[PDB]
Amino acid sequence: PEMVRGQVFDVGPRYTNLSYIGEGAYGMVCSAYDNVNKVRVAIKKISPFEHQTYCQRTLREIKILLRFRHENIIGINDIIRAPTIEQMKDVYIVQDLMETDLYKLLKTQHLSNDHICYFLYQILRGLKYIHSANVLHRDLKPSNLLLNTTCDLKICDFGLARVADPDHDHTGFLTEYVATRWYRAPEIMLNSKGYTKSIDIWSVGCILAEMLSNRPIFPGKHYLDQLNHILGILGSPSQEDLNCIINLKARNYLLSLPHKNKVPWNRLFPNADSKALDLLDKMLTFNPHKRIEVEQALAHPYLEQYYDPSDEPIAEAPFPKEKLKELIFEETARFQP
Numbered sequence: 001p002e003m004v005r006g007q008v009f010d011v012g013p014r015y016t017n018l019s020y021i022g023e024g025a026y027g028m029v030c031s032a033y034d035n036v037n038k039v040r041v042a043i044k045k046i047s048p049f050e051h052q053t054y055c056q057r058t059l060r061e062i063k064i065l066l067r068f069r070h071e072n073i074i075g076i077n078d079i080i081r082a083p084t085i086e087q088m089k090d091v092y093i094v095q096d097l098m099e100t101d102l103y104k105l106l107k108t109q110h111l112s113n114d115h116i117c118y119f120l121y122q123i124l125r126g127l128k129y130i131h132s133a134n135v136l137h138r139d140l141k142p143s144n145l146l147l148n149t150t151c152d153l154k155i156c157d158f159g160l161a162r163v164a165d166p167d168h169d170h171t172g173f174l175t176e177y178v179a180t181r182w183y184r185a186p187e188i189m190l191n192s193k194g195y196t197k198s199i200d201i202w203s204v205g206c207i208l209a210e211m212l213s214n215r216p217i218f219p220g221k222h223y224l225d226q227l228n229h230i231l232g233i234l235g236s237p238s239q240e241d242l243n244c245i246i247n248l249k250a251r252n253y254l255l256s257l258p259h260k261n262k263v264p265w266n267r268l269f270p271n272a273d274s275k276a277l278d279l280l281d282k283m284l285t286f287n288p289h290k291r292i293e294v295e296q297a298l299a300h301p302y303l304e305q306y307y308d309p310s311d312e313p314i315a316e317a318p319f320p321k322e323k324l325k326e327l328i329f330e331e332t333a334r335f336q337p
């Protein structure tokens with residue numbers, strides 16, 4: 001049984017020669033040599049079984065990633081676990097190894113306009129498929145966009161994903177939320193549970209802005225500071241957009257703020273392609289009803305060199321800790337001999 005950083009890796013003998021990569025609240029990640037398909041692979045040790053929310057997230061991802069098949073969405077190649085529930089303490093998810101992610105890339109590299117266009121194309125192409133399955137990713141951010149040495153992009157981390165539920169999207173003002181702060185749509189802080197496809201388009205808009213300057217566009221330091229940053233650039237909402245917020249606490253908060261003028265995109269991004277900034281504007285629309293949809297974004301002039309709806313496929317099949325351990329056990333059975 002190989003060891004890495006105070007953790008066993010029961011992955012062998014198929015997978016050998018491990019090197020550490022990263023870790024989190026309930027898992028660790030290594031590269032490894034796969035002896036059957038003769039390549040290095042990524043492996044994620046997940047240890048969720050003590051906690052119901054980690055169980056929920058592990059199960060969501062497995063179920064989604066096994067149903068999905070798309071060039072721009074990370075797949076699962078293998079799952080390794082003990083042969084019985086009783087002996088199962090960890091799950092290892094095997095996936096294609098990717099050179100880097102967009103978070104690491106943006107911290108070190110200037111992107112050409114051609115790179116930005118191609119990355120945005122692939123994000124939206126993957127997202128078209130995700131949304132066509134009635135799924136919302138709900139945590140799109142640069143670190144969840146993996147890249148290989150030829151700049152092919154795959155969306156990962158479906159642990160916060162939900163089935164879309166637009167009729168049950170409304171909530172009160174300043175209702176707590178789980179997804180990453182800098183990529184949260186303004187409506188999350190006002191009146192939305194993040195159950196609509198528009199939540200994901202806002203995150204893509206933020207990612208686009210961050211590709212243009214190598215800096216997050218809305219770097220809030222805490223829940224309501226996030227709205228502060230958004231309004232600092234978009235300006236005060238229009239009368240019509242306020243009228244769509246019927247919740248009085250959310251409405252009256254916005255009414256309380258001094259007038260702020262829109263910062264023009266071409267002032268924030270003086271070297272950007274004008275067509276990129278037109279698409280940016282449409283993704284970072286304050287009102288989610290007016291916000292561009294994935295399929296319209298793909299059809300936008302900025303992406304004209306790539307747009308091809310016949311090669312932008314859709315999904316064929318849209319969608320306690322003790323029982324969730326069993327469902328994880330059931331869902332991973334197909335990888336056993």
Ligand SMILES: O=C(CN1Cc2ccc(-c3nc(NC4CCOCC4)ncc3Cl)cc2C1=O)N1CCc2ccccc2CC1
Binds near residue numbers: 022024029100
């Ligand atoms: O598995 C997740 C969420 N993650 C975290 C992650 C890391 C890495 C990869 C990954 N990276 C690479 N190439 C890296 C090389 C070096 O440059 C960076 C990219 N290639 C393939 C994958 Cl598949 C994918 C994921 C992913 O899907 N969760 C459960 C437990 C856990 C475990 C570890 C960290 C956080 C968490 C919480 C959520």
